Design a protein around this ligand. Sequence first.
Ligand code: SF4
Ligand SMILES: [Mg+2]
Ligand SMILES: [Zn+2]
Lengths: 225, 319, 70, 303, 14, 196, 289, 75, 77
Amino acid sequence: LIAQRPSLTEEVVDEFRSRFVIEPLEPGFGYTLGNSLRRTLLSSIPGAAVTSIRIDGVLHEFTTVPGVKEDVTDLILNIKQLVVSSEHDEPVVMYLRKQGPGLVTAADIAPPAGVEVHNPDLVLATLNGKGKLEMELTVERGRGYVSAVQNKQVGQEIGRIPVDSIYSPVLKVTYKVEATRVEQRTDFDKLIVDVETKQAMRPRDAMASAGKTLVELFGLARELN
Amino acid sequence: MLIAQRPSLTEEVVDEFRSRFVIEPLEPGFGYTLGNSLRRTLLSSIPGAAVTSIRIDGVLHEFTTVPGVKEDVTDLILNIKQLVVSSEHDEPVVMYLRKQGPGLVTAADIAPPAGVEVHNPDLVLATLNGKGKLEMELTVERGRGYVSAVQNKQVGQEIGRIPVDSIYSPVLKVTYKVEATRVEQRTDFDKLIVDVETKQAMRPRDAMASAGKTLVELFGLARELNIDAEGIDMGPSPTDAALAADLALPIEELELTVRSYNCLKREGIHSVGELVARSEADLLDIRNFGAKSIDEVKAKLAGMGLALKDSPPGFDPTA
Amino acid sequence: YGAAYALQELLTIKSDDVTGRVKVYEAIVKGENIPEPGIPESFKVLIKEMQSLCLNVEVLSSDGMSIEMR
Amino acid sequence: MTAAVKDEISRLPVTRTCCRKAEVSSILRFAGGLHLVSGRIVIEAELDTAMAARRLKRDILEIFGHSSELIVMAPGGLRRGSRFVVRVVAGGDQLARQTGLVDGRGRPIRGLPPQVVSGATCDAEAAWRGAFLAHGSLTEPGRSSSLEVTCPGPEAALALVGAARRLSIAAKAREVRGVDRVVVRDGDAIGALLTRLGAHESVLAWEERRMRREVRATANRLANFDDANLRRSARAAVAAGARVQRALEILGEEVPEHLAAAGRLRMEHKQASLEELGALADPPLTKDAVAGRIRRLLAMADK
Amino acid sequence: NIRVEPTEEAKAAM
Amino acid sequence: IILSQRLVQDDVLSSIHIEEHEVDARDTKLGPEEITRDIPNVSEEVLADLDERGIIRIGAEVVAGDILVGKVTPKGETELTPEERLLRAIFGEKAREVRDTSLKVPHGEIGKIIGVRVFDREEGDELPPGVNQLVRVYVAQKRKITDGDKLAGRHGNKGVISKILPIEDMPFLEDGTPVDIILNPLGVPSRMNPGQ
Amino acid sequence: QLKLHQCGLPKAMALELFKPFVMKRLVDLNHAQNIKSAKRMVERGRTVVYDVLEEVIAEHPVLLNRAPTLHRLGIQAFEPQLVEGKAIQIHPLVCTAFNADFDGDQMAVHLPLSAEAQAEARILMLSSNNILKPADGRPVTMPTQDMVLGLFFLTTDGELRDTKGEGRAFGSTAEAIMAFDAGELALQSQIDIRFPVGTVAPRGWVPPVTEEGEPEWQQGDSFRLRTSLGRALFNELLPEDYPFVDYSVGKKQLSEIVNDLAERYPKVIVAATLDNLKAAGFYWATRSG
Amino acid sequence: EDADEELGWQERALCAQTDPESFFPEKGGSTREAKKVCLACEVRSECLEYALQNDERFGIWGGLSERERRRLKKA
Amino acid sequence: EGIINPPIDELLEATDSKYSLVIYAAKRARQINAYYSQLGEGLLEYVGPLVDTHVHEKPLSIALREINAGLLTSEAI
Ligand code: SF4
Ligand SMILES: [Mg+2]
Ligand SMILES: [Zn+2]
């Protein structure tokens, strides 16, 4: 019987990639913890995302703006990959305005205070000499994937276009267990969880949130006595 | 974020030592995140004590039969393995069984030393015929989970030692399943059912509590990375959520002696919370004091159970 | 299968019993017993065509008396 | 007094679904309430009757599909009532919405639900059954009687009056000190109504009582029916003397001089009025003194 | 061509 | 076939479908039919997305039962049953003598309005004889992949999606890459198409 | 996840099929004042309408049919339940009876109305009372694919497998499972397992351990057996009275077992055993490799 | 609530929960009861407007009798 | 629970075959439904149910439960 308790340490591979090493666990007990952490990370990590738009001269998705090279149904696919973070529990709004020829990168949006656009290099559209773009993007907070239909408000406007929302800052999570067989006359596991996030928060915060959620969930079983 | 629907855990009892717990309603998913974890923690993360090896007599390895006893070596080893014991010594402890003559040698004939106990004396270990003798030795020690005789084979060779599989974990069999449960709201809300079966020593509820505590510690290990990190908030903890109906109510009292209520109203007490704590000194020092008034603010004050000088919740008045 | 009532309702009060469809709808809406099926319209159309072919089709009761189907 | 009639009413078997829905709606509208909690709604119903609580519970569960609690904490709060409070927590919002208490996406409903009103006459009979079970009083201001039900507002009182009209009966709404009720003064109408509700044994007992008692000619008029009313208040003082004999069964607990003298004067001069009794005191004491003394004697002999 | 009716014993119980 | 939720998140298998609804105002014995938003007896809320000439607005979202084009057809003199006449007398709603035949979306249809094309016989359009006016309305909707939709490959391997699992609970490679589709191997050998 | 007597209807089809019943029910519960308002409420598709539908749909069988109807088992009565989608859900076992594949096939649903029709669809045409085939008498409601494979991989000999253990003695099947969870035992390795006093010894097994002065009984004899863990897990699916199988179970053996169960046991037990076999076969086919 | 729809001001009439016969007295009947009831109804203004628009000289609407409605309509 | 309750084997111990059981249960169900429909109006010969019921239970299920419990008898006319 071992009296040693498991301990966790962190290593940084990239600014948005970390390896968390947990050891020593009981034999045949690392895969379960790793998979539970992976499920929690990929499922229920809160974030912020765009939830609707409206353009100056557009009434529905299935049309095109004079002067831009993309349909209004491709701008939507381009702004779905728009990684943002928000601090206001209300539906914040930001404005995009561009005139003249050139590429409308994500760096051309004017976020208000408390919200950010974390990848100011995504290309949203390209305008010729006779085209101008003016639109407003609504930012909300949530978790998981919320479809456009669920984003429809009651009695909305004619020009409001709801959009699919992906409230998830975690990009790729994996794990691996090494059977250490450490020299204590016994065998034990060593779990290593590799976490990569999409440049919205560091993996440490994602792991902390997952741990908080799992602790809250298991507390109900703990207090059964 | 807020879960908006706190799950609940409910137990059912099938036998003396068999239970069936239900957790519901879990969010979509989450029936598999904490099902395999609970099962494995129950089956491999609870301390126990068990027999490690036995020394039947000065003569053995004649696996055909042990002289004097009806059964054979394998049946004897299985019967020993069924034994349930509890121990407190970290080091191995040796006890002896010295039944003699014809009859049925059972667990009650063992002579455990101090610090160890056998919880099922009625278990039958063998049958002796023809005035046979059975002078057996059992070594007991603590551990976790199931560890086989492999990993217990001793390089040092002793004539009579025979290692046996050790079942340390109190819980013997755990199964789980998940189902859909929601009708009012959207479907896909998970309900988790876990069937637990243990041995005579421990009840399923204790095993569930220990597993939950261990998992909570394990995941707090990771939550410590950044304490100021948002997660899924259950919100209304049942204890204080229920006790808010009587502990932090603005009304000091509803039914009580009018004299005492009037005296304490205009003296610096509005909500019962301000009075529950630091009661003795406040009632003593200031002009407002009473000898038998304690009976009206100590016993009858406990609308649903409460003593004074108790920490009150909601210290911020919701003015 | 040997299910006669299911077949009879599938052939009369769900397809052809003109006066039976409304009665069964009313019975369900008012929460009472479904009424007995009648005689389908297709049989009457067949008899009319056969009579139009100068054939003396007629239905007889227990005694040798015609019913005339209204 | 009334308890027997209410028991006869409640024990009666009711079959038609509309009548049961109407009775449940009426009982929930008179002697029940909504208690907003946690942003949702819970329904409570406090009944001062033996089994009508079971009747309401069963009717709710069967015709509406809900499960009740039936906590027997007394309604008065002093534990003396020993009367039953039935509660509905889970789904009580739907019970409130589909019983008629609250509808239209707005505040609760002041009077009876619109569905109980404008229904077959049997439905009005059910409405009276429920209303008379919730509250009620079968008073006898003299030899002829008068029903009474304290409705929770003028709208409910007027609705009950209208429902009575459909039963051919005569009803009168009334209000005093801001609390209002429905009164049917005529004794024959009282019997007619109490027959419709369902009670018959109680009807027979009331009919024999009033018929025998009322036939006491006193020339009507003032000073000839007024003296009859002085004698009727003297019979009320005879009931007070029965309370005094209840106090005697209790022994009165070794009462002091004043109350003993007052009780003795009341008993010996069983017909003398309070003023007349007071005139008999050695130090002439006013009607007020005897009034207070009888008040406090009744208070003491309450146990 | 049957006739269904509760037994005498069953009627009394209810 | 089992699918991943990613194929629904990223519109990998989503497609736009368009339908057209056509209605014409023609001539009748009791006078011509007209297209207008002055429908005889309709709660005003329905006539909210209709424009000046009674044709739904471009960009409006329709659901089953909605009105696309407002049309009124005359019916002439008729005799009402006693109950209907008594009810009308109660509520005093004078009959208009023209009923509604407006064009409505069929049952189980949704989508936005893409285009409205209207032809007038009095504007020189070559409408057939006895057709005063014609109008066509286009409704478009984007469909995502859902269970019941049929998928297939190039080797004659087809099947209907019977499940769409979350991304987390999908068999994932050693580096955390979930698989987007799971196919039964029992169908490969017996069908003799090892090409897949 | 369905049982042998259950089917899954999309809520649109269910609502359109049961319209009069739901109208009457929601008029009864005062969710509407009259049939006109109830009809409008159902047509507009409110929320409580589906809550009422979920309870008017209970214990009302529906006939499921697939054209062409080559034999009487092509029409079968199922108990419906609402599912979220636009496609029906069919238990995997009845497919063979319907000759139904899942590559675009369609089926039709009919609704019995009267008490006689419901009684016929409930007693005569029920799905779990039609195990055998009228043509020759062999079961058709039997595990067919990915279940035969699972129950075969489970109950088979370790010819070329990495059979580890092969000589260990276990005091119960729970201990064997605990040893298997750890990388110590194989699902097909031959081990000595002791069974409780409830199990029935294998058909044959005429000799117990040779004794003297005290015999063994056909039941209540705590007997050790040389068998694999997979065979014990398989036998934990059959009824409590069924003798131990202890041999490889392909499709012929499984067909014989199902025929014996149908002949010797009530219908409810047979349906429960079939569902147990279905679930276990799917699980172990997933874990088969 | 979840109704999400209103038919009009009729649904919010207090008199619906009260004796409908009290608003049409007979043979010398009184008017205090119905008039008192109307003064608490929220849609009283709408009821009076509807009564004036339809110009019906029977019953009492908006808390006014037929004679009061005539006098108001005179202007 | 559900449509498989009571079991067919137990029910068949009270009749001769499935065909007769169908008519037996159907007639009992019609009697129960008629009793419910006309319960409010004047009394009629219809009786039952003879067993504990639910809020809104199908009369056929109640009839089958009564048949299984042994509270009914079928004659020949
Ligand atoms: S004002 Fe009109 S709606 Fe209101 S209570 Fe009076 S009559 Fe009824
Ligand atoms: Mg096919
Ligand atoms: Zn009635």
